[PDB]
């Protein structure tokens, strides 16, 4: 749905965000052990939370903001989310020509390009599978030429199936509120909404 | 023992359990993931070092398999005496034949030149023994009036 953003619509300032956190929320268990060791172990998911904070909103800034949102509970459409740091537009050229070997899994892409991507990537950027929702970030990055191996930290929540392409620009994380059960918003007297702050979570 | 029927064998059990009632202690505690497969009669030795317990021979009681990786091990105490069991006494003469559930018959008998020789039977329960000939239909009847 593509929650608004100033390069969606730059006509309604203030719906940038002034504060963007990525919860790096990994469940997971932990025991300490007396012999100084610590034993961990990863179960369930790792979803990407983002905190988004809004300023004070005026009546059209606001009222755009709640057709969104309205239109976002209404539908079943997961909230898809731009962040503009991580926006760096390296590696360029097009994805289609680049292929992914038959099954990879295990945090590890190694991914070939014949003529079509030029550029390299820095660790650190986010990266995304074309068919599968969720968005990865670089740990570390090696190259032989037309051969790439990218490491990512999420261990790979799909498998490979031997068509799955690169985006490396304009991914959008596939998010719903974990605000919507009280979702509400303080109508001041000097007639700016305030105090409204969204909790998103990845739903891929 | 409701399903033992030797009684040297069942003698050895006794004495076993005894032993092992005996020695009577239990620990609980958990140990992590590396000791999977801890079944619940398995042997370990426990070597808590301020208790004084180098090697201690503990047999399992519990084991806990969770989700996370620990397990909730619980012990009993079994030190090699219940299991190098002793020796038992020769049980063969005390032997109680069921010999008391039927009538007994005359002691004695033999005819002497009529068939008088019967001595009368030491089952108390008597009334009147039967002589049955080779040609007489009708079995003759000797009561016993004292």
């Known amino acids: 749905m593509r929650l608004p953003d100033p390069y969606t619509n730059p006509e309604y300032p203030g719906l940038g965000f002034e504060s963007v956190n990525l919860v790096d929320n990994d469940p997971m268990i932990r025991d300490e052990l007396p012999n100084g060791?610590?034993?961990?172990?990863?179960?369930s998911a790792?979803?990407?939370?983002?905190?988004?904070?809004?300023?004070?909103?005026?009546?059209?800034?606001?009222?755009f903001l709640d057709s969104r949102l309205l239109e976002?509970?209404?539908?079943?459409?997961?909230?898809?989310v731009l962040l503009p740091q991580y926006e760096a537009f390296r590696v360029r050229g097009d994805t289609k020509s680049v292929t992914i070997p038959a099954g990879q899994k295990g945090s590890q892409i190694i991914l070939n390009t014949n003529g079509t991507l030029t550029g390299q990537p820095k660790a650190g950027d986010l990266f995304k599978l074309s068919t599968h929702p969720k968005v990865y970030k670089i740990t570390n990055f090696s190259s032989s030429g037309n051969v790439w191996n990218i490491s990512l930290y999420p261990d790979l929540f799909i498998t490979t199936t031997g068509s799955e392409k690169p985006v490396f620009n304009g991914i959008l994380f596939r998010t719903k509120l974990m605000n919507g059960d009280s979702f509400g918003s303080t109508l001041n007297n000097n007639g700016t909404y305030s105090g409204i702050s969204l909790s998103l979570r990845e739903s891929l | 023992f409701a399903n033992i029927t030797n009684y040297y064998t069942a003698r050895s059990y006794a004495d076993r359990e005894l032993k092992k009632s005996r020695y009577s202690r239990t620990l609980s505690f958990s140990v992590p993931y590396k000791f999977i497969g801890i079944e619940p009669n398995d042997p370990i030795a426990f070597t808590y070092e301020r208790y004084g317990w180098k090697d201690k021979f503990f047999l399992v009681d519990e084991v806990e398999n969770t989700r996370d990786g620990k397990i909730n091990?619980?012990?009993?105490?079994?030190?090699?005496?219940?299991?190098?069991?002793?020796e038992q006494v020769?049980?063969?003469?005390?032997?109680?034949?069921?010999?008391?559930?039927?009538?007994?018959?005359?002691?004695?008998?033999?005819?002497?030149?009529?068939?008088?020789?019967w001595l009368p039977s030491l089952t108390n329960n008597v009334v009147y023994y039967s002589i049955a000939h080779s040609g007489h239909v009708n079995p003759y009847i000797v009561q016993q009036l004292e």
């Open chain 1, 37 to 43: 060791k610590v034993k961990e172990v990863k179960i």
């Open chain 1, 46 to 63: 790792q979803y990407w939370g983002i905190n988004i904070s809004y300023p004070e909103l005026f009546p059209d800034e606001y009222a």
């Open chain 1, 72 to 80: 976002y509970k209404r539908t079943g459409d997961y909230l898809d």
């Open chain 2, 73 to 86: 091990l619980v012990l009993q105490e079994y030190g090699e005496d219940v299991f190098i069991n002793s």
């Open chain 2, 90 to 117: 020769d049980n063969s003469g005390n032997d109680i034949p069921d010999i008391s559930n039927n009538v007994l018959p005359p002691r004695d008998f033999k005819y002497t030149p009529g068939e008088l020789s």
